[PDB]
CSV table of C-alpha atoms in Angstrom, one decimal:
chain,number,residue,atom,x,y,z
G,1,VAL,CA,122.5,39.2,72.4
G,2,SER,CA,123.8,38.3,75.9
G,3,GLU,CA,126.6,40.9,75.2
G,4,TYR,CA,123.9,43.6,75.8
G,5,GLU,CA,121.8,44.6,78.7
G,6,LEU,CA,118.2,44.4,77.5
G,7,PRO,CA,115.6,46.5,79.3
G,8,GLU,CA,113.3,44.0,81.0
G,9,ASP,CA,109.9,45.4,81.9
G,10,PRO,CA,107.8,43.0,84.1
G,11,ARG,CA,104.5,44.7,83.0
G,12,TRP,CA,105.3,43.7,79.4
G,13,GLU,CA,107.5,40.6,79.6
G,14,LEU,CA,106.2,37.4,78.1
G,15,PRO,CA,108.0,34.0,78.5
G,16,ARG,CA,109.3,33.0,75.1
G,17,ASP,CA,107.6,29.5,75.3
G,18,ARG,CA,104.2,31.2,75.4
G,19,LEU,CA,104.6,32.1,71.7
G,20,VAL,CA,103.9,29.6,69.0
G,21,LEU,CA,105.7,31.0,66.0
G,22,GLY,CA,104.1,30.8,62.6
G,23,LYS,CA,104.4,32.2,59.1
G,24,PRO,CA,106.4,35.3,58.1
G,25,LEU,CA,104.3,38.5,57.8
G,26,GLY,CA,107.1,40.6,56.3
G,27,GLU,CA,110.8,41.3,56.0
G,28,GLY,CA,112.8,44.5,55.6
G,29,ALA,CA,116.6,44.6,56.0
G,30,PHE,CA,116.6,44.3,59.8
G,31,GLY,CA,114.5,42.6,60.5
G,32,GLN,CA,111.4,40.4,60.3
G,33,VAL,CA,107.8,40.1,61.6
G,34,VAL,CA,106.2,36.7,62.0
G,35,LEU,CA,102.7,35.7,62.9
G,36,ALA,CA,102.3,33.9,66.2
G,37,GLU,CA,99.9,32.5,68.7
G,38,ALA,CA,100.4,33.8,72.2
G,39,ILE,CA,99.3,31.6,75.1
G,40,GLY,CA,97.9,33.5,78.1
G,41,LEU,CA,98.8,37.0,76.8
G,42,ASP,CA,96.2,38.4,79.3
G,43,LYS,CA,97.3,37.1,82.7
G,44,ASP,CA,93.7,36.8,83.9
G,45,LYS,CA,92.8,34.5,80.9
G,46,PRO,CA,95.8,32.1,81.0
G,47,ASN,CA,94.3,29.5,78.7
G,48,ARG,CA,93.3,31.8,75.8
G,49,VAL,CA,95.2,32.0,72.6
G,50,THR,CA,95.8,35.4,70.8
G,51,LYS,CA,97.1,35.9,67.3
G,52,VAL,CA,99.9,38.5,67.4
G,53,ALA,CA,102.7,39.9,65.2
G,54,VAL,CA,106.2,39.3,66.5
G,55,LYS,CA,108.9,41.7,65.4
G,56,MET,CA,112.6,40.6,65.6
G,57,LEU,CA,116.0,41.4,64.2
G,58,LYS,CA,117.6,39.6,61.2
G,59,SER,CA,120.6,37.4,61.6
G,60,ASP,CA,122.8,40.2,60.2
G,61,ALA,CA,121.5,42.8,62.6
G,62,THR,CA,123.9,45.3,64.3
G,63,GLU,CA,124.1,47.2,67.6
G,64,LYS,CA,122.3,50.1,66.1
G,65,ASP,CA,119.5,47.9,64.7
G,66,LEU,CA,119.0,46.5,68.2
G,67,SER,CA,118.9,50.0,69.6
G,68,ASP,CA,116.3,51.0,66.9
G,69,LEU,CA,114.0,48.0,67.8
G,70,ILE,CA,114.3,48.8,71.6
G,71,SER,CA,113.6,52.4,70.8
G,72,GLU,CA,110.5,51.6,68.9
G,73,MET,CA,109.3,49.4,71.8
G,74,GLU,CA,110.0,52.1,74.4
G,75,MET,CA,108.3,54.8,72.2
G,76,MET,CA,105.2,52.6,71.9
G,77,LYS,CA,105.1,52.3,75.7
G,78,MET,CA,105.3,56.0,76.2
G,79,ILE,CA,102.8,56.8,73.5
G,80,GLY,CA,100.2,54.5,75.0
G,81,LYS,CA,97.3,52.7,73.5
G,82,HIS,CA,94.7,53.7,70.8
G,83,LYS,CA,92.1,51.8,68.8
G,84,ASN,CA,93.6,53.1,65.5
G,85,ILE,CA,97.3,52.4,66.0
G,86,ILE,CA,99.2,49.1,66.0
G,87,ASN,CA,99.6,48.7,69.8
G,88,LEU,CA,102.4,47.1,71.9
G,89,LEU,CA,101.2,43.8,73.5
G,90,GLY,CA,104.4,42.5,75.1
G,91,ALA,CA,108.0,41.6,74.7
G,92,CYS,CA,110.6,38.8,75.1
G,93,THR,CA,113.9,40.2,76.4
G,94,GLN,CA,115.4,37.5,78.5
G,95,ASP,CA,116.6,34.1,77.3
G,96,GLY,CA,117.1,34.8,73.6
G,97,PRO,CA,116.7,37.4,70.8
G,98,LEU,CA,114.6,40.5,71.4
G,99,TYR,CA,110.9,40.0,70.5
G,100,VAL,CA,108.6,43.0,70.3
G,101,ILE,CA,105.0,41.7,70.3
G,102,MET,CA,102.4,43.9,68.6
G,103,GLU,CA,98.8,43.7,67.4
G,104,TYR,CA,98.1,41.6,64.3
G,105,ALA,CA,96.2,43.0,61.4
G,106,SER,CA,95.0,40.0,59.5
G,107,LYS,CA,93.8,41.8,56.3
G,108,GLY,CA,97.2,43.4,55.5
G,109,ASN,CA,98.0,47.0,54.5
G,110,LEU,CA,95.4,49.5,53.3
G,111,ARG,CA,96.8,49.9,49.8
G,112,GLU,CA,96.4,46.1,49.0
G,113,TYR,CA,93.2,45.9,50.9
G,114,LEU,CA,91.6,48.6,48.7
G,115,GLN,CA,93.1,47.3,45.4
G,116,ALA,CA,91.6,43.9,46.0
G,117,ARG,CA,88.2,45.6,46.4
G,118,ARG,CA,88.2,47.6,43.2
G,119,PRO,CA,85.0,47.2,41.2
G,120,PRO,CA,85.3,46.9,37.3
G,121,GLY,CA,84.0,50.4,36.3
G,122,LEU,CA,85.7,53.4,34.6
G,123,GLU,CA,86.3,55.0,37.9
G,124,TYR,CA,89.3,52.9,39.0
G,125,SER,CA,92.3,51.1,37.6
G,126,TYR,CA,92.0,47.4,37.3
G,127,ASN,CA,91.7,44.9,40.2
G,128,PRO,CA,95.0,43.0,40.5
G,129,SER,CA,93.9,40.5,43.1
G,130,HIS,CA,93.6,36.9,42.3
G,131,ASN,CA,91.0,36.8,45.1
G,132,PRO,CA,88.9,39.9,44.7
G,133,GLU,CA,86.7,40.9,47.6
G,134,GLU,CA,83.4,42.8,48.1
G,135,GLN,CA,83.5,46.4,47.0
G,136,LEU,CA,83.4,49.0,49.8
G,137,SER,CA,80.5,51.4,50.1
G,138,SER,CA,81.0,55.2,50.0
G,139,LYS,CA,80.5,55.5,53.7
G,140,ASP,CA,83.2,52.8,54.3
G,141,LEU,CA,85.9,54.7,52.4
G,142,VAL,CA,85.3,58.0,54.4
G,143,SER,CA,85.1,55.9,57.6
G,144,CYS,CA,88.5,54.5,56.6
G,145,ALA,CA,89.9,58.1,56.5
G,146,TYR,CA,88.1,59.1,59.7
G,147,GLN,CA,89.8,56.2,61.6
G,148,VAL,CA,93.2,57.0,60.2
G,149,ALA,CA,92.7,60.7,61.1
G,150,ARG,CA,91.6,59.6,64.5
G,151,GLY,CA,94.8,57.6,65.0
G,152,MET,CA,97.0,60.5,63.8
G,153,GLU,CA,95.1,62.9,66.0
G,154,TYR,CA,95.9,60.7,69.0
G,155,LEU,CA,99.5,60.3,67.9
G,156,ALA,CA,99.9,64.1,67.4
G,157,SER,CA,98.5,64.6,70.9
G,158,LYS,CA,101.3,62.4,72.2
G,159,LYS,CA,103.8,64.5,70.2
G,160,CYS,CA,104.5,61.7,67.8
G,161,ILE,CA,105.5,62.8,64.3
G,162,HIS,CA,105.1,59.7,62.1
G,163,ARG,CA,107.2,61.0,59.0
G,164,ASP,CA,106.0,58.3,56.6
G,165,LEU,CA,102.2,58.2,56.8
G,166,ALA,CA,101.0,56.3,53.7
G,167,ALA,CA,98.3,53.6,52.9
G,168,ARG,CA,101.1,51.1,52.9
G,169,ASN,CA,101.6,52.0,56.6
G,170,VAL,CA,98.0,51.6,57.6
G,171,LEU,CA,97.0,48.0,58.5
G,172,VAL,CA,93.5,46.5,58.5
G,173,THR,CA,92.4,44.1,61.2
G,174,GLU,CA,90.0,41.1,61.0
G,175,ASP,CA,87.3,43.5,62.0
G,176,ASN,CA,88.2,46.1,59.4
G,177,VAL,CA,89.7,48.5,62.0
G,178,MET,CA,92.3,50.8,60.6
G,179,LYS,CA,95.6,50.8,62.5
G,180,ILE,CA,98.5,53.1,61.9
G,181,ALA,CA,101.8,51.1,61.8
G,182,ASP,CA,105.5,52.1,62.1
G,183,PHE,CA,104.7,55.4,64.0
G,184,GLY,CA,107.5,54.6,66.6
G,185,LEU,CA,110.4,54.0,64.2
G,186,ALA,CA,113.7,55.7,65.0
G,187,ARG,CA,114.7,58.6,62.7
G,188,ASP,CA,117.8,57.8,60.6
G,189,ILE,CA,120.7,60.0,61.6
G,190,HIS,CA,122.2,60.0,58.1
G,191,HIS,CA,120.9,62.0,55.2
G,192,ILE,CA,118.1,60.7,52.9
G,193,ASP,CA,118.3,59.1,49.4
G,194,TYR,CA,115.3,60.4,47.5
G,195,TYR,CA,115.4,57.6,45.0
G,196,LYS,CA,115.6,54.6,47.4
G,197,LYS,CA,112.7,52.2,46.9
G,198,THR,CA,111.3,50.4,49.9
G,199,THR,CA,111.3,46.6,50.3
G,200,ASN,CA,108.1,46.6,48.1
G,201,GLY,CA,109.6,49.2,45.8
G,202,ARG,CA,107.6,52.3,47.0
G,203,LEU,CA,109.2,55.8,46.7
G,204,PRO,CA,108.6,57.5,50.0
G,205,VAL,CA,109.3,61.0,48.6
G,206,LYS,CA,105.9,61.0,47.0
G,207,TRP,CA,104.3,61.4,50.5
G,208,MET,CA,106.7,64.1,51.9
G,209,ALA,CA,105.6,67.7,52.4
G,210,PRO,CA,107.8,70.1,50.3
G,211,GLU,CA,109.5,71.4,53.5
G,212,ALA,CA,110.3,67.7,54.5
G,213,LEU,CA,111.5,67.0,51.0
G,214,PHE,CA,113.8,70.0,50.5
G,215,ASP,CA,114.7,70.9,54.1
G,216,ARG,CA,114.2,67.6,56.0
G,217,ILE,CA,111.8,69.5,58.3
G,218,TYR,CA,109.2,67.1,59.7
G,219,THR,CA,106.3,68.3,61.9
G,220,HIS,CA,102.7,67.4,62.6
G,221,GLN,CA,101.9,69.6,59.6
G,222,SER,CA,104.1,67.6,57.2
G,223,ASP,CA,102.1,64.6,58.6
G,224,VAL,CA,98.9,66.4,57.6
G,225,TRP,CA,100.4,66.7,54.0
G,226,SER,CA,101.0,63.0,54.0
G,227,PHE,CA,97.4,62.4,55.1
G,228,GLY,CA,96.3,64.3,52.1
G,229,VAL,CA,98.2,61.9,49.8
G,230,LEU,CA,96.7,59.0,51.8
G,231,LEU,CA,93.2,60.4,51.3
G,232,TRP,CA,94.0,60.4,47.5
G,233,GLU,CA,95.2,56.8,47.8
G,234,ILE,CA,91.9,55.9,49.5
G,235,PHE,CA,89.6,57.4,46.8
G,236,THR,CA,91.7,55.8,44.1
G,237,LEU,CA,91.3,52.5,46.0
G,238,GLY,CA,95.0,52.2,46.3
G,239,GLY,CA,96.3,54.2,43.4
G,240,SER,CA,100.0,55.2,43.0
G,241,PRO,CA,100.5,59.0,43.7
G,242,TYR,CA,101.7,61.2,40.8
G,243,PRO,CA,101.4,58.5,38.1
G,244,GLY,CA,104.1,58.9,35.5
G,245,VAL,CA,106.0,61.7,37.3
G,246,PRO,CA,109.6,60.8,38.1
G,247,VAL,CA,111.3,62.0,41.3
G,248,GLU,CA,113.8,64.5,39.9
G,249,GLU,CA,110.7,66.2,38.4
G,250,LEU,CA,108.5,66.0,41.5
G,251,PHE,CA,110.9,68.5,43.1
G,252,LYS,CA,110.1,71.1,40.4
G,253,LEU,CA,106.3,70.3,40.1
G,254,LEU,CA,105.5,70.8,43.8
G,255,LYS,CA,107.5,74.1,43.8
G,256,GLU,CA,105.2,75.4,41.0
G,257,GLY,CA,102.1,74.7,43.1
G,258,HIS,CA,101.4,71.5,41.1
G,259,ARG,CA,99.1,69.1,42.9
G,260,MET,CA,97.4,65.8,41.9
G,261,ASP,CA,94.1,65.9,40.1
G,262,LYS,CA,90.9,64.8,41.8
G,263,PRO,CA,90.3,61.1,41.6
G,264,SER,CA,87.4,60.2,39.3
G,265,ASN,CA,85.2,59.0,42.2
G,266,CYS,CA,85.7,61.7,44.8
G,267,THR,CA,83.4,64.5,46.1
G,268,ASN,CA,84.5,68.1,45.7
G,269,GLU,CA,84.4,68.4,49.5
G,270,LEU,CA,86.9,65.5,49.9
G,271,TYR,CA,89.1,66.9,47.2
G,272,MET,CA,89.1,70.3,48.9
G,273,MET,CA,90.3,68.5,52.1
G,274,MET,CA,93.2,67.0,50.1
G,275,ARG,CA,94.1,70.4,48.7
G,276,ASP,CA,93.9,72.0,52.1
G,277,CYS,CA,96.3,69.3,53.4
G,278,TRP,CA,98.6,70.2,50.6
G,279,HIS,CA,98.8,73.9,51.4
G,280,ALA,CA,102.3,75.1,50.6
G,281,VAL,CA,102.5,76.9,53.9
G,282,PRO,CA,102.6,74.4,56.8
G,283,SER,CA,100.9,76.8,59.2
G,284,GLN,CA,97.9,77.0,56.8
G,285,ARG,CA,97.1,73.2,56.6
G,286,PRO,CA,94.3,71.9,58.8
G,287,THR,CA,95.2,70.0,62.0
G,288,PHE,CA,94.3,66.4,62.6
G,289,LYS,CA,91.7,67.6,65.2
G,290,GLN,CA,90.0,69.7,62.4
G,291,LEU,CA,90.3,66.7,60.0
G,292,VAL,CA,88.7,64.3,62.6
G,293,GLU,CA,85.8,66.7,63.1
G,294,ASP,CA,85.3,67.3,59.3
G,295,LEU,CA,85.5,63.6,58.5
G,296,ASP,CA,83.1,62.7,61.3
G,297,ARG,CA,80.5,65.0,59.8
G,298,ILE,CA,81.2,63.8,56.3
G,299,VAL,CA,80.8,60.1,57.3
G,300,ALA,CA,77.3,60.9,58.8
G,301,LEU,CA,76.2,62.6,55.5
G,302,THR,CA,77.8,59.9,53.2
G,303,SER,CA,75.7,57.1,51.9
G,304,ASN,CA,76.3,53.4,52.3
G,305,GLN,CA,73.9,52.7,49.5
């Protein structure tokens, strides 16, 4: 790593020995995220400990992988802070491997968070968690969507196109705050494999707008399409999109104006929002600003009983 000039930034630099490294949080090619305790992250509270997520490259990482990680870090700096995104907290760039320090979401990703809170009724697939948690009220689910819309509205205003908005990329903090993750990732410069499964075997094509899918055109409006799919994931408490539809087929279906059916427990108004997000013509989908305003009103009218 000493072969490279790493961008040191005194506003963000944290001495390596101020991090007590803990358990893995995840792993995906290059590279890995570990839980850590950071001593004196806030310079004015030097004896405070903060739980953080520490992102680093794998042992097999390449010059491009390092460039990607740096790029994510610099992008997060430029995008700035928001309550509903995974924020940058600091970095270790001198005396060892690049560490990018980010906010820690202790309750994991939204898909697994919702699946562990599935009640036993007819209205959801079965709860797969060995440690089931308290069911969420109706208000809570809409509020979940509100917060994600809020985060995306902020990101869109900073001219950040996410390109893979999905429940798996929303994280939940100890206080049940929704935080959009992986918004700063570098765009792959090689073409896409529409059948590649992620490191948890998810098929990303099921969240892509048709123009992203067929033409690789990504905009804020294709992100709005993804948000529609995420809304569907929410009101299925973590369901898998287009159940039983294989990829090669998804191409054809979307073309014919095929859309997912309304989840069993979903209001007509929330289902219309989904359908609006899945308008065939990008210019005709709502914007994140409209979505934030609509969902704000809907949260107020929705019951937590």
